[PDB]
Amino acid sequence: SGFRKMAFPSGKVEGCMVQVTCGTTTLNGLWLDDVVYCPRHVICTSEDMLNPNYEDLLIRKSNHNFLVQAGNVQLRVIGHSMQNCVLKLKVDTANPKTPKYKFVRIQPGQTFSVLACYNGSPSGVYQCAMRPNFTIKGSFLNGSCGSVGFNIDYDCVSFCYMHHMELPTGVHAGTDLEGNFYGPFVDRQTAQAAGTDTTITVNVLAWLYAAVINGDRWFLNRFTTTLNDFNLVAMKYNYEPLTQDHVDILGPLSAQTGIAVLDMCASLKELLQNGMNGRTILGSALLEDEFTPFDVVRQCSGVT
Amino acid sequence: SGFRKMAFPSGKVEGCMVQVTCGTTTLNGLWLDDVVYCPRHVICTSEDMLNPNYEDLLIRKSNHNFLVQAGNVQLRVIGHSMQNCVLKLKVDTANPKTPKYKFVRIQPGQTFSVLACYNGSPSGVYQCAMRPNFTIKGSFLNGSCGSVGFNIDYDCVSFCYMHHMELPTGVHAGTDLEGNFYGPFVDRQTAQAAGTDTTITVNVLAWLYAAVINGDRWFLNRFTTTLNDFNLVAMKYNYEPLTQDHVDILGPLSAQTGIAVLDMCASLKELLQNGMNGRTILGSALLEDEFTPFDVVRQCSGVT
Numbered sequence: 207s208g209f210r211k212m213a214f215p216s217g218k219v220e221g222c223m224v225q226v227t228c229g230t231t232t233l234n235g236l237w238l239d240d241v242v243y244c245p246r247h248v249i250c251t252s253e254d255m256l257n258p259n260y261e262d263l264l265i266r267k268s269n270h271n272f273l274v275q276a277g278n279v280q281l282r283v284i285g286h287s288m289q290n291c292v293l294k295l296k297v298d299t300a301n302p303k304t305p306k307y308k309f310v311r312i313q314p315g316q317t318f319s320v321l322a323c324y325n326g327s328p329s330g331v332y333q334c335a336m337r338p339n340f341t342i343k344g345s346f347l348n349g350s351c352g353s354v355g356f357n358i359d360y361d362c363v364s365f366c367y368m369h370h371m372e373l374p375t376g377v378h379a380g381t382d383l384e385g386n387f388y389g390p391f392v393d394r395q396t397a398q399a400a401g402t403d404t405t406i407t408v409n410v411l412a413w414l415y416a417a418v419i420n421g422d423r424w425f426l427n428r429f430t431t432t433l434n435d436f437n438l439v440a441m442k443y444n445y446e447p448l449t450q451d452h453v454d455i456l457g458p459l460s461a462q463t464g465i466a467v468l469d470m471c472a473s474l475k476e477l478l479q480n481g482m483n484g485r486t487i488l489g490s491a492l493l494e495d496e497f498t499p500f501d502v503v504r505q506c507s508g509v510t
Numbered sequence: 511s512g513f514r515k516m517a518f519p520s521g522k523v524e525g526c527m528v529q530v531t532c533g534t535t536t537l538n539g540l541w542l543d544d545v546v547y548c549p550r551h552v553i554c555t556s557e558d559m560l561n562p563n564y565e566d567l568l569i570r571k572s573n574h575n576f577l578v579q580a581g582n583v584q585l586r587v588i589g590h591s592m593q594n595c596v597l598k599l600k601v602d603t604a605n606p607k608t609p610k611y612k613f614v615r616i617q618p619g620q621t622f623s624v625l626a627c628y629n630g631s632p633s634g635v636y637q638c639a640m641r642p643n644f645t646i647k648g649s650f651l652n653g654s655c656g657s658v659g660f661n662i663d664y665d666c667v668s669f670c671y672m673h674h675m676e677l678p679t680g681v682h683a684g685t686d687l688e689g690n691f692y693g694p695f696v697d698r699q700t701a702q703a704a705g706t707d708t709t710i711t712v713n714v715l716a717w718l719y720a721a722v723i724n725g726d727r728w729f730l731n732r733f734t735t736t737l738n739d740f741n742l743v744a745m746k747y748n749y750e751p752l753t754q755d756h757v758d759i760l761g762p763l764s765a766q767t768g769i770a771v772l773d774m775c776a777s778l779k780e781l782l783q784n785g786m787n788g789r790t791i792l793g794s795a796l797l798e799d800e801f802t803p804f805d806v807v808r809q810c811s812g813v814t
């Protein structure tokens with residue numbers, strides 16, 4: 207029993223973190239096989255970040271200007287290329303610790319673990335969700351750029367995020383491992399504001415199922431609802447509309463607990479309308495939306 | 511910017527997890543040098559757990575009855591001994607991945623990372639605090655016993671916890687790495703109830719400092735208090751009494767933000783008396799107490 211905001215074990219990812227320096231800028235890189243991936247803004251000064259012409263700035267850079275250090279040993283850069291907002295530095299040595307891996311572009315509402323790094327050294331690991339406005343609420347200080355987000359399926363690491371920017375509002379923006387930003391964000395120090403940070407409804411319902419499994423049942427009521435009726439309330443509360451696809455994904459949790467998905471929606475509806483009244487669910491005073499239905503199943507079954 | 515419930519990178523600890531089986535019971539062990547540490551209740555069936563005589567049950571066990579598997583390779587057990595509530599299995603091979611390490615017995619209010627494991631395989635990592643009633647609120651299912659809690663100081667892992675029990679209330683109990691339980695708990699399936707789970711006041715104040723540093727300042731008021739006056743309110747709200755030692759530990763956070771420790775106590779006092787009024791602090795609707803002042807400094811400075 208017990209339910210925690212849990213990250214994946216980070217060992218496989220720690221073995222990939224390197225330090226990348228270009229001029230006076232130092233950030234993190236991800237070393238997989240003989241390639242080091244890092245934000246292309248490593249070539250920028252804070253002045254350049256106001257209006258960077260990346261192709262032009264890159265003309266002045268050669269392989270020897272990209273200093274890559276893995277632990278305390280320097281890697282030899284034998285090639286470099288820019289793919290969207292990431293630089294790929296080809297090195298002469300394949301990372302001996304390269305895990306089985308994939309590059310995946312996640313959807314909003316999906317969760318992942320971030321290994322926050324500074325100067326190629328891991329400092330901590332925490333769990334995130336890609337928000338419906340394509341920002342993440344992370345913990346990133348100067349030097350953390352190039353830290354990556356990931357999920358693990360047994361022994362295969364699926365890298366889904368690379369940290370690039372902190373918006374003036376304190377939220378974070380970044381790219382998948384092909385260098386395409388999530389959402390409308392760009393790697394430029396400019397006024398970039400996020401849209402509405404709606405709540406990931408399917409995740410909140412999955413977390414209400416985790417709560418029932420772990421003994422917190424006070425919020426269960428005698429009501430039911432329909433998707434349309436539920437969605438009128440979700441709209442009013444800035445919650446994502448619930449679809450039949452979400453109902454289907456919650457199927458296994460519904461089966462395990464015997465609580466129909468629409469009955470859990472009705473409990474959620476009353477919680478939205480009435481609040482918590484000073485009570486908590488799984489030690490939280492708000493409805494948690496950063497556990498997917500897969501995360502709840504995984505944690506409630508002990509997948510390794 | 512941004513402040514998250516962050517765990518230490520778990521790689522160094524993942525390299526130490528092994529599977530230990532005795533008869534029909536399988537749990538986790540911690541392999542450091544040529545020793546594997548695991549809960550002594552590995553020798554018990556669920557029937558034995560009602561009233562186990564560990565010395566007597568251990569007489570029927572030989573080195574060859576303890577099956578230790580590291581990954582998919584079996585380790586040879588050449589000695590075994592019981593130290594308090596842990597078994598130490600001497601193996602013929604030193605763990606090649608043994609990090610620099612210490613065994614420390616923590617105080618209530620101290621935080622640590624747990625690497626939840628099943629069958630010697632890491633499933634996830636999360637941050638905990640040793641509660642003032644010596645329980646932890648973890649996420650542990652059957653098979654998770656032997657999972658460990660730890661902190662890291664650069665390259666040295668200080669192991670402070672080993673998971674042994676889940677109380678009927680769903681909270682968790684365990685030992686330090688010398689096998690002494692935290693608090694009054696025993697490794698017996700019996701009625702064991704926890705005392706008052708008070709709030710770790712110094713941690714909540716450290717987290718209010720993290721909130722000010724990260725821009726959440728609405729709760730700051732025009733008041734101050736004294737330790738005695740603050741403690742009258744802390745007592746009423748089941749908060750730990752604040753001491754001059756706690757005020758001293760918050761010194762660096764006070765200096766960095768320019769908010770006197772007693773002024774932050776007065777903000778905390780008003781939050782206790784008035785509630786949050788539907789507002790949040792660092793995305794939480796309750797006062798978080800599982801960040802120590804050291805954790806706040808570390809996360810707000812990017813220590814690796």
Ligand SMILES: Cc1c([C@@H](C)C(=O)O)ccc2c1[nH]c1ccc(Cl)cc12
Pocket residue numbers: 241284285286287294295296
């Ligand atoms: C894989 C790769 C890279 C990486 C960065 C990549 O583009 O994936 C960069 C540069 C080169 C490269 N293969 C080469 C073969 C011939 C020559 Cl002349 C250059 C390169």
Ligand SMILES: Cc1c([C@@H](C)C(=O)O)ccc2c1[nH]c1ccc(Cl)cc12
Pocket residue numbers: 545588589590591598599600
């Ligand atoms: C370190 C150690 C252990 C571990 C479990 C320990 O007690 O720390 C267990 C058993 C033995 C041991 N050294 C030995 C030397 C001679 C003999 Cl006859 C037995 C043992």
